[PDB]
Paper text:
The point of convergence is the cleavage of the 186 kDa complement component 3 (C3) generating the C3b fragment (178 kDa) which becomes covalently associated with the activator surface. The C3bBb complex is the AP C3 convertase, which catalyzes further C3 cleavage. In contrast, properdin (FP) is a direct positive regulator of the AP and stabilizes the convertase by associating with C3b in the convertase and proconvertase, reviewed. FP oligomerizes prior to secretion, and in plasma it is found in a mass distribution with roughly 25% tetramers, 50% trimers and 25% dimers.
Author numbering: 2 to 125
Write the structure that this text describes.
Amino acid sequence: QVQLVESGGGLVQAGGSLRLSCAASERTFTIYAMGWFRQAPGKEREFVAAISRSGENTDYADSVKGRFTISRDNNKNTISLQMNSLKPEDTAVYYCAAGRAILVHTTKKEYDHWGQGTQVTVSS
């Protein structure tokens, strides 16, 4: 079983950037496809971005395409979310997620493991 730890959230002004990171358990790191989701006030959780086991393939929600970039470090057992041109509607708890994938280049939308979250608040 895998554990997941998000970091890097905080309070930022609209137009700013933030970089989130997610640490995942070392011994199983590369068995899991990984992703980011977020849950804004009053809303269901929303898929944000996904990355394959290999780190070579990615997928994004239309709401963040071009502003957010997901990356993976298979040296250090992390994934990252670079968030640029932030807007108030990006305010949410951001969750890292993991799920087994048979192939190394597959991205997932459904995940069975997720972190406690990191809070992101974008003010104007």
